[PDB]
Structure 1
């Protein structure tokens, strides 16, 4: 039959506008509402779910014409949820200066510019043919279209409503259509049997916020939820002891971190940031809370970067001697510094924070936990330390070092990181040269500067665990 799925989740996105929903909790919903032109084959080249060969989706075919331009031939008679046919005009709009990457687009998609390629205006050749262009050369256009930046929006409806209102009543081409959105509580979507692709296999999907992981585990056990997300390896034995239930876990291409508001005088310079960084004992946190399943990367450096992955890079440094030394140099009065966390939105956010509070006490710093509820985030002026994550969404080190931490990103712009000039010039350089020894060495230079400056501190890649009924064979949680 087709069941109504009930999914207990760690969090609900602030919006369903597909770019502004980019987070750990938005994509699992917006990937059902919207489609992309092309998709990654997660099992290509023997890959165990992290493959990269690109396959047709809204685009039936595509041809790279030159180093700046890619022609996409679109499927025909694809319907948006309101009965409007998708055409090249919609795809052009999705990647337009008006909506995405122009100067005024930043007021409503604040991060569109930092996460955009160096686009020029798309060209519509006919109803079903669109050419995506870049002002400067880049080989990333095609894989970018398979990413969370590539979800196709309906031009007329979206432009009429505007970005914010569209985010509360989204219309897409995907296999599920919008029914309801209750901020900080739930999203309901229903089967779209007019979908161009395979017929939806669930009648409806409800994403219900269940803040505490033990409540999600109990809800799965009692049948209140069919699927639950964001568990840890410690929950696996209990769940797997029920023959009707199971867990699935794997290392994700995402890192957990803590970061700083660098507009605050206490974090305006590198010494205290680097001190907090060098006192984090990662193997201890991983052994205590992750059953040694979370992995510690050798810097801001991940295997999915391909040609810009360094398999021989050194480990990130643990040095409480230098940390004590840097605390004293900064003239640290001894005042408590807040660390904001939205409960366990990140798996093990609170138990990891309590272990780091003890580690920072052992080097002279007093950090206090400020645990808040969804929607109760502090104003920037009230934020000092906070936890975050970054999903490594491209097969190139451009994401997320340059997206997030580069001169156009939110870490320098919104959160006040005054990066060294060499860092910003290297960011500009790597974004205009092809893969080579020079490009490889330049990213290693950027990684070195990142660790010297500590605008953020990388903890580990979590071992992401979800769980479900065995008789629920399709799980829309990524």
Structure 2
């Protein structure tokens, strides 16, 4: 009776464990298998997929009890896909030190300074931080929020769980063939709205042209990760149409600052100032992508500055910084996994011409999916950052802050003021002091260039008109109240 939904995707996450799966590819599957305590209701009050409104989901209700603690009263009788009941012990294990120190390597890095949860009774749990945090609600309504089954997860382990996941969500896991496909089936025991698809298959078609062809042949219902130039060919078919939105993600490139050439900021800044981002955005994105003024976005709220000035493209100063660095003309690789990111390779080719004008030789190192390149082989690599809280702390603090990946793993030796301001904004209410501390972090980041911010992508999907689904302003696919078949 219900139609089978087929989605052609750019890739699959390494795992379906909610934290390990954090990437451009995981949420669109994880969002279907799991629910969090709080859900971002993208379409609430007439919004077109961009509403920040957080509403209770596995939590029937909640109350903030002090500046570091929230008491959650859970929905009763909700079942995981294996029959076990969702209780306070599952929620406590989800945000426990045992689960978040998985060796799940980024559980600790993305999380606030959680104190241990308190199970007050079967359906009541207090989630709390060791220091004051006014962001707890936002953290529990984000991609960190999915609730996992304690006993099943403990018996399997994080990675085996990530291959056979069990959650409470509208679609249950059926099968996975690594780097090929994931198939989910409707959970007719779902506590929320009835799932409208019989099955949902996510099938990897790494090349966009082959993926557009699949939609025309009728092998796919929806396809992901297209560019604004693909819209003309697709929209020509009366049966098909494109659906796009400006998402809360940033396309960027970053450096292995352990490498001697990038241990200092001089050549990082030359590589940053030589990029003419408005020309790339015009030529490849039809001006649909948006250049931000540092890590600065409308969904941040009180920490968004509309009047902030952008970083200027300056070839003259980039040439002078190249000369100043002593750069001897060694070709620098730029690792890119094909077009995992929309317009990744055409943007790199344009930037190579801009870097050549500055006197820098950058060569592409296109690597196939499945090839996990070693850290030592990386010089420049592309990346993206999902701005995953409706707040300024993510991703300037969460990715580039003290003790986290960019500084520890990739060796960015950040200034003292930056790291102190990162700690201060975690324990600080919105207002005048917080807003200026974020514009100070933005100024330091611009001067050090541990990464270069390209643009906020205009995320383009394509679909059959007989599949009623609207994209959301994030790197996921929401089908709750947003998936009908004509």
Question: Is TM > 0.5 for Structure 1 vs Structure 2?
Answer: yes
2:223 is matched with: 228
Coordinate RMSD, CA, aligned: 1.3
Residue in structure 1 matching 2:242, options 247, 256, 279: 247
Q: Does 1:424 align with 2:419?
A: yes
Q: What's the secondary structure of 1:91's corresponding residue? A: helix
1:9 is matched with: 9
2:161 is matched with: 166
Q: Does 1:65 align with 2:62?
A: no
1:19 is matched with: 19
CA distance in 2, matches of 1:160, 1:293: 47
CA distance in 1, matches of 2:233, 2:314: 38
1:385 is matched with: 380
Q: Does 1:447 align with 2:442?
A: yes
1:45 offset after TM fit, Å? 6.1
Q: Which string of whole-angstrom CA distances, capped at 9 and with x for unpartnered residues, describes residues 409-449 of structure 1?
A: 21001111010111111111111221121111111111011
Residue in structure 2 matching 1:316, options 311, 316, 327: 311
CA distance in 2, matches of 1:45, 1:264: 50
Deviates more, 1:45-54 or 1:406-415: 45-54
Q: What's the secondary structure of 1:6's corresponding residue? A: strand
Q: Does 1:398 align with 2:393?
A: yes
Q: What's the secondary structure of 1:31's corresponding residue? A: helix
- 1:328-339 aligned within 5 A: 328-339=323-334
CA distance in 2, matches of 1:477, 1:74: 25
Q: Does 1:295 align with 2:322?
A: no
Q: What's the secondary structure of 1:65's corresponding residue? A: strand
Distance verdict in 2 for CA 1:106–1:365, change over 3 Å: farther
2:481 is matched with: none
Q: Does 1:140 align with 2:132?
A: no
Q: Please tell me whether the aligned partners of residues 342 and 377 of structure 1 are also in contact (alpha carbons under 8 angstroms).
A: no
Q: Please tell me whether the aligned partners of residues 31 and 477 of structure 2 are also in contact (alpha carbons under 8 angstroms).
A: no
1:192 is matched with: 187
CA distance in 1, matches of 2:387, 2:258: 26
2:207 is matched with: 212
1:462 is matched with: 457
2:40 is matched with: 40
1:347 offset after TM fit, Å? 0.2
Q: Which string of whole-angstrom CA distances, capped at 9 and with x for unpartnered residues, describes residues 13-32 of structure 1?
A: 11111111000000000100
What is the aligned residue count? Answer: 473
Deviates more, 1:41-50 or 1:221-230: 41-50
1:47 offset after TM fit, Å? 4.1
CA distance in 2, matches of 1:83, 1:60: 20
Q: Which string of whole-angstrom CA distances, capped at 9 and with x for unpartnered residues, describes residues 243-265 of structure 1?
A: 11111111111110011011111
CA distance in 2, matches of 1:289, 1:465: 13
Q: Please tell me whether the aligned partners of residues 6 and 225 of structure 1 are also in contact (alpha carbons under 8 angstroms).
A: yes
Q: What's the secondary structure of 1:308's corresponding residue? A: coil
Deviates more, 1:23-32 or 1:303-312: 303-312
Q: What's the secondary structure of 1:295's corresponding residue? A: coil
- 1:113-124 aligned within 5 A: 113-124=108-119
2:257 is matched with: 262
Residue in structure 2 matching 1:285, options 267, 271, 280: 280
1:402 offset after TM fit, Å? 0.3
Q: Which string of whole-angstrom CA distances, capped at 9 and with x for unpartnered residues, describes residues 30-66 of structure 1?
A: 1001111111122446643221222121111111112
- 1:86-101 aligned within 5 A: 86-100=86-100
CA distance in 1, matches of 2:349, 2:244: 24
Q: What's the secondary structure of 2:110's corresponding residue? A: coil
Q: Please tell me whether the aligned partners of residues 19 and 112 of structure 1 are also in contact (alpha carbons under 8 angstroms).
A: yes
1:273 offset after TM fit, Å? 0.5
Q: Does 1:176 align with 2:171?
A: yes
Normalised to the residue count of structure 1, the TM-score between the two structures is 0.97
1:159 offset after TM fit, Å? 1.0
Q: Which string of whole-angstrom CA distances, capped at 9 and with x for unpartnered residues, describes residues 257-312 of structure 1?
A: 01101111111110000000000001110111011111111111111111111111
1:141 offset after TM fit, Å? 1.2
Query: Which consecutive residues of structure 2, in runs of 5 or more, have no partner in the other structure?
Result: 471-475, 479-486
1:357 is matched with: 352
Q: Which string of whole-angstrom CA distances, capped at 9 and with x for unpartnered residues, describes residues 347-392 of structure 1?
A: 0000000000111111111111011111113100000100000011
CA distance in 1, matches of 2:307, 2:241: 36
Q: Which string of whole-angstrom CA distances, capped at 9 and with x for unpartnered residues, describes residues 93-126 of structure 1?
A: 10111111xxxx051x211112111211111111
1:316 offset after TM fit, Å? 1.1
Q: Does 1:370 align with 2:365?
A: yes
Q: Does 1:348 align with 2:354?
A: no
